[PDB]
């Protein structure tokens, strides 16, 4: 347990072995204390010395200890990560990727992951210094299973951070260069590699349709759907986010998710005990029911309309809001027969019950859906029978309440629904 002052004295000794012992002491402070004194180490001026130790090819022990110390400094706040970058650490760590010692190479991988993890600017700076080619070179083996497990997890995680963040998204050419390795990782049977590989794919699909397309073109949707059914929540969470991202794209991109068999997983996703899974699954459904009528029909055929009735009836409120969107999208683009089916499944009562929500947006969304359903009933001449159903379950009074509702945008719909179907 050295003091920072003694570490400084050791590192200033210009005795390589004294410097190694002091760098190890610094590593132990940074790795073993519960509040490690990162700012004290930075204020002491040690980062430039640590960075210069990364180049001591003749003393691989001090390369490792300084790489570890700098890794942990870079794991902190953006200002602490910036201190590491400002000391010249990026090119030094990239050079260390070529070390013949796997534990040192791996430590450089980890440190670069922390730097890129800070945000898009340091991510793009790591890329501009040329990290991608040597990172990918470490994974250029015929079978990933011959690599050490911890080593492969660290590389996967660092590559996922190079895929991470928007404003801006990563450079298109970097994504194109990383994707084949990422795809291979996505097929590797280590649950931690799979989780982080899924996380990377979820970042790359979180963008415009052109970004979605370069992922979908690599043929990963069947594997994402397989991972969608995993037992490990750390895998299902990013797989579902990536699937949800993809169906925000074109109808054709959405069709590849359906073709791959994703909808057969949604009975369990839409009833999942983890609130966030249910919410994301219902969000995903809302962007599928915003699709074509044949895509709505596959939602019907897989039996998912009763599950949407269920989440609308009872779920966390944010999940109920996504379900209200799913219904408004369904009623907006569905056929009359599909909308009739929705009503037969019991959508009206849970829809009316949510008109008591304090949230203004969900009220708007629901009234829109009710408008769409009446439009279907107009083409069948059944507008009265529906207004009976709505009054029968107490929905008519909530319509009455809402044309005294403060917000600008509930009146015109309450108003009009009454003028047309209730007076």
């Amino acid at each position: 347990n050295w003091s920072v002052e003694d570490i400084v004295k050791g590192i200033n000794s210009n005795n390589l072995e004294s410097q190694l012992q002091a760098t190890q002491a610094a590593r132990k402070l940074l790795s073993r204390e519960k509040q490690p004194p990162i700012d004290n180490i930075i204020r002491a001026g040690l980062i430039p010395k640590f960075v210069s130790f990364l180049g001591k090819t003749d003393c691989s022990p001090i390369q490792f200890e300084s790489a570890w110390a700098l890794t942990n400094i870079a794991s902190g706040t953006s200002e602490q990560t910036k201190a590491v970058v400002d000391g010249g650490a990026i090119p030094a760590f990239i050079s260390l990727l070529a070390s013949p010692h796997a534990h040192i190479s791996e430590q450089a991988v980890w440190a670069l992951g922390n730097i890129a993890g800070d945000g898009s600017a340091f991510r793009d700076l790591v890329i501009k210094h040329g990290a991608i080619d040597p990172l990918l070179a470490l994974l250029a083996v015929p079978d990933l299973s011959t690599l050490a497990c911890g080593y492969l997890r660290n590389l996967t995680w660092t590559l996922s951070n190079l895929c991470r963040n928007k404003n801006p998204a990563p450079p298109l050419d970097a994504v194109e260069q990383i994707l084949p390795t990422l795809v291979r990782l996505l097929h590797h049977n280590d649950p931690e590699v799979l989780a982080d590989s899924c996380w990377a794919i979820s970042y790359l699909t979180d963008g415009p349709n052109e970004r979605i397309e370069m992922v979908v073109k690599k043929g990963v949707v069947p594997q994402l759907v397989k991972l969608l059914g995993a037992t490990e929540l750390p895998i299902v969470t990013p797989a579902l986010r990536a699937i949800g991202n993809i169906v925000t794209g074109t109808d054709e991109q959405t069709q590849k998710v359906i073709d791959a068999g994703a909808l057969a997983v949604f009975p369990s996703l839409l009833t999942n005990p983890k609130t966030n899974i249910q919410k994301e699954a219902t969000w995903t459904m809302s962007n599928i029911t915003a699709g074509r009528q044949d895509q709505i029909q596959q939602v019907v055929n897989h039996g998912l309309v009763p599950f949407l009735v269920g989440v609308l009836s009872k779920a966390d409120f944010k999940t109920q809001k996504e379900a209200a969107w799913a219904i408004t999208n369904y009623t907006s683009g569905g056929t009359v027969e599909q909308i009739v089916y929705l009503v037969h499944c019991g959508i009206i009562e849970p829809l009316m019950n949510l008109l008591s929500a304090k949230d203004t947006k969900i009220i708007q969304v629901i009234l829109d859906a009710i408008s769409n359903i009446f439009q279907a009933a107009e083409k069948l001449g059944e507008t009265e029978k529906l207004s009976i159903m709505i009054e029968e379950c107490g929905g008519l009074d909530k319509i009455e309440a809402l044309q005294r509702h403060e917000n600008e945008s509930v009146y015109k719909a309450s108003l009009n629904l009454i003028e047309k179907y209730f007076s």
């Binding site: 940074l30 790795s31 490690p36 942990n72 794991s75 990560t81 992951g113 800070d118 996380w199």
Partner: peptide, 10 residues
């Protein structure tokens, strides 16, 4: 999402 950064402990 998952953690942006990781410290190496012990």
């Amino acid at each position: 999402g998952p953690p942006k950064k990781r410290a190496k402990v012990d």
